[PDB]
Structure 1
């Protein structure tokens, strides 16, 4: 069950402000118009590979999706991230939890941190042990698909966990679809505005129009 991935997967690749510049970068991004996988929370959380970073989205109305479980074996044999958001605090643990066969929520620890209408676009990846959460919330009015448009993604939390991850799983609040992109080494050309916000990006391997936009370092190709 797939859908379209129109313009999503565009994050701020670094913590450096730049304004009114067409800066090129080479990092792990979501390719434009690729296949993001449509899932269920109706009337569904299998074990998804990670290979080179993982995009996430969640069309939400009542905060059903509330947790993440990462790792490789996920049965208290290796370290496992468990980002828990019970509506008031962000609890982030890397303990070896004795998970269930179907872990959910009912309506050797080395780190711990404690802090449809909504689309909670999340990005998760590892860079040499530095686990980086990139995220963005936005008000949408669409129940079926990713809303066509554009909005950039900022970081929230770096994590120096050093965890080998090849597989993962999310969590639900059982008494809301969610997407799995995959990040790839795609060179972009980011358009920072006057306020330093990405208004446009061009994937430098999408179609041969787009390589012309990357070679010229411009978006209006004459």
Structure 2
């Protein structure tokens, strides 16, 4: 299934405060009015290629979507990233793990050979995520506040603010979502040029594409 993404997918590019200034940037963004592969994994989580950062969304306000396993071969031969939830803290483990056919998670574990790094941190609800890997740095941008402009579809304008940064420095060419045992959108992003308008308080209030329309 295909869904039209109206205007979602704008994030703060850097850590610089601005006010009442029109700023033009050239960065990896989600093109406006694009197509996203709507999934219906309800009584179905195939593996999707990474391809230079991925968008992600969800519309269910409970703990069913848990983790996102990353890697290039999904085997103990090469290190694989794991980011999982616990309803009390979020833990990240890049240590090598073996293959899993139908992993189950919610509130799989095969081996921990050559463990290297660990990290511990803290209408329905929309959870919008952006995963990026640049110069060996892993970046995750997140937004958890939904707005009901229209029902059954994610329409509206919202910004994404960074949470964490990881200096791992590994190759990622493959990822997979993890479920439990008993409707999320996926999109790719391209190096576009955007124009952004900042409020007087430093919040992005409007975005304009630079390669869409003659008026643009």
TM-score by length of 1: 0.88
Distance 1:142 1:203, change over 3 A: closer
In structure 1, the gaps of 5 or more residues are 211-222
State the shift of 1:209 in Å.
Answer: 1.7
Q: CA RMSD in A?
A: 1.7
State the shift of 1:147 in Å.
Answer: 2.2
Distance 2:88 2:99 in 1: 23
In the TM superposition, what whole-angstrom CA distance separates every residue of 1:100-129 from its partner, at most 9, and x where no partner exists?
A: 1122216x2222111251111000010011
Could you tell which deviates more after superposition, 182-191 or 92-101?
92-101
How is 1:175-190 mapped onto 2 (pairs within 5 angstroms)?
Answer: 175=182, 177-190=183-196
Distance 1:162 1:182 in 2: 21
Higher strand residue share: 1
Contact 2:147 2:156 in 1 (8 A): no
Distance 1:113 1:146 in 2: 35
Distance 2:212 2:168 in 1: 34
In the TM superposition, what whole-angstrom CA distance separates every residue of 1:61-115 from its partner, at most 9, and x where no partner exists?
A: 2121010001111122211111101211101111111231122216x22221112
Contact 1:69 1:80 in 2 (8 A): yes
Structure 1's consecutive aligned runs of 4 or more residues displaced over 2 angstroms after TM superposition are: 139-147
Contact 2:149 2:155 in 1 (8 A): no
Q: What SS does the aligned partner of 1:48 have?
A: coil
In structure 2, the gaps of 5 or more residues are 107-113
Contact 1:117 1:142 in 2 (8 A): no
In the TM superposition, what whole-angstrom CA distance separates every residue of 1:43-62 from its partner, at most 9, and x where no partner exists?
A: 11111111121111111221
State the shift of 1:140 in Å.
Answer: 4.1
Distance 1:102 1:152 in 2: 34
Distance 1:146 1:22, change over 3 A: farther
Contact 1:59 1:143 in 2 (8 A): no
How is 1:30-45 mapped onto 2 (pairs within 5 angstroms)?
Answer: 30-45=30-45
TM-score by length of 2: 0.90
In the TM superposition, what whole-angstrom CA distance separates every residue of 1:168-196 from its partner, at most 9, and x where no partner exists?
A: 10111333x11111110011111111111
Query: Which one of the candidate residues 116, 119, 127 is aligned to 1:120?
Result: 127
Contact 1:72 1:166 in 2 (8 A): yes
Q: What SS does the aligned partner of 2:67 have?
A: strand
Q: What SS does the aligned partner of 1:138 have?
A: coil
State the shift of 1:145 in Å.
Answer: 4.6
Contact 1:8 1:32 in 2 (8 A): yes
Distance 1:92 1:143 in 2: 35
Q: What SS does the aligned partner of 1:150 have?
A: coil
